[PDB]
Amino acid sequence: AMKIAFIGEAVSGFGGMETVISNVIHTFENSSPKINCEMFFFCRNDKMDKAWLKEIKYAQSFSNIKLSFLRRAKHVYNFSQWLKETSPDIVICIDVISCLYANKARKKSGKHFTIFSWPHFSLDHKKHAECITYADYHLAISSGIKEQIMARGISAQDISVVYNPVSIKTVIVPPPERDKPAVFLYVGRLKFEGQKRVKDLFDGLARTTGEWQLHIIGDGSDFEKCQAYSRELGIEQRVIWYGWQSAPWQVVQQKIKNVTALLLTSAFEGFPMTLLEAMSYGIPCISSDCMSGPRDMIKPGLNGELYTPGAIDDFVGHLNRVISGEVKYQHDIIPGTIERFYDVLYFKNFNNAIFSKL
Ligand SMILES: O=c1ccn([C@@H]2O[C@H](COP(=O)(O)OP(=O)(O)O)[C@@H](O)[C@H]2O)c(=O)[nH]1
């Protein structure tokens, strides 16, 4: 009879991380008859949308004390009391600050349990990275995060790389027929520079050789700035804008139908779920080799390419070769190149990472 507690600071209730957590919780509560799951949130308000939790048992610590020393002390106390009521065997922290809370509350509460980190963002691009050292073991969604954890002094043996899940598909998006233009796809929020660097996408494509089209599914404040840039570069007649779409992969299948590659030019990424989605549909991905994620999914020459951050020359080379056919990715086998990310095997490896450390 195992009970697992997932804890973190309040989240919005919409986002990639929330989806992964509710699914991991839900399949946990079916695994061994039903080893039980519940949540604990540290909140300064109750603005978190509760939809994703409708089937999940959860409790909260509310404190809007403005001095953070006092607020954290109250959070630790509230969690210490919940620990006594609940007696979890395992506590998994979905952010780094909660590893400190869980550690301090374990000592205060006198309870025994094992503390795992399971952060969903690169430690270096987020606020409280040094609190990672308060967890017992670590669940890393990428090789990049495992490296940042080791950088703080943690032994590699105490860190399991668990990736993140994606659903198996039963449709393959084929390449365009030969003699048709190459079809590139960009799916994501538009930022001209900043995190997403749509500037780099447009700069690279403008320098390429051969016939191509770019389909952009997404929106953002930089829309007009990106549209002006495509006009400036003279590529606007090869770009089709779809705005934000609730079902981007339905738009791909029904409206675009044939895709050469998905492109991602980001400066950084928390976890680029978009790449996994694309490869689940057999679409190769050419991505910047940024912190973090793309290098754990992309196998160069097999399901796409990586380029060193800022190496737009290299990015262009990858585009030219896939347009010409000098390099060809086989869409029919690409879905199998991300085997370890698919739901069932993901959960088996995730489950084994938790219980192997006990
Ligand atoms: O028009 C869009 C563009 C993005 N996505 C989805 O949003 C995620 C990636 O979006 P984003 O680039 O904003 O990543 P984030 O910054 O939210 O982590 C992927 O799962 C996409 O399938 C979507 O549903 N509609």
- 277 annotated binding-site participant: yes
Q: How far apart (Å, rounded) are the C-alpha atoms in residues 330 and 309? A: 26
SS3 14: coil
Rounded Cα distance, 298 and 112, in Å: 40
CA-nearest of 108, 164, 166, 106 to 135 is 106
Are 330 and 242 found together in one domain? yes
Statement to judge: residues 183 and 319 lie in one domain: yes
Structure tokens given for 52 = 């994703």
What is the domain count for the chain?
2
CB of 188 within 6 A of ligand 1: the answer is yes
Q: How far apart are CA 285 and CA 20, in angstroms?
A: 22
- Name the experimental technique: X-ray
Burial code (b: 16+ CB inside 10 Å, e: under 16) for 281-293 equals bbbbbbbbbbbbb
**Coil, strand or helix at 30:** coil
**Euclidean distance between CA atoms 216 and 213, whole angstroms:** 10
Q: Are the C-beta atoms of 236 and 204 separated by less than 8 Å? A: no
Q: Contact at 8 Å (CB) between 202 and 229?
A: yes
225 and 150 belong to one structural domain: no
Task: Please report where in the chains the tokens 């606020």 appear, as a residue.
Answer: 127
Please give the single-letter amino acid code of residue 192. F
Q: Does the C-beta of 14 come closer than 6 Å to ligand 1?
A: no
Is the domain of 262 the same as that of 327? yes
State phi, psi for 182 to the nearest 5 degrees.
-65, 145
- 227 lies in which domain range? 166-341
Q: Which atom of ligand 1 is nearest to the CA of 217?
A: 1
Helices 16-28 and 343-356 pack at an angle, to 10 degrees, of 70
Residue 305 bridge partners (DSSP): 286
Question: Do both 84 and 173 map to the same domain?
Answer: no
Residue 239 structure tokens? 């770009």
Distance CA 101, CA 80 (A): 9
CA-closest residue to ligand 1 atom 24:
246
Q: Is 250 within any annotated ligand binding site?
A: no
Residues 120 and 189 grouped into a single domain: no
Strand-pair partners of 285:
262, 304
What type of residue sits at position 324?
Answer: S
Amino acid at 301: G
For ligand 1, pick from 122, 189, 244 the residue to mutate: most ligand atoms within 8 Å of CB. Answer: 189
* Same domain as 349, residue 334: no
Instruction: Say whether both 158 and 233 belong to one domain.
Output: no
Phi then psi for residue 137, to 5 deg, are: -135, 170
Q: Are residues 187 and 335 in the same domain?
A: yes
**Token pair belonging to 216:** 């952009």
Based on the domain organization, do 181 and 276 belong to the same domain? yes
190 and 207 belong to one structural domain: yes
Strands (E) across 272-324 are located at 285-288, 304-307
**Whether the Cβ atoms of residue 184 and residue 214 lie closer than 8 Å to each other:** yes
Q: Which residues on adjacent β-strands are paired with residue 304?
A: 285, 300
Residues 121 and 257 in one domain: no
Buried b (16+ CB within 10 A) or exposed e, 302-336: ebbbbbebeebebbbbbbbbbbeeebebebeebbe
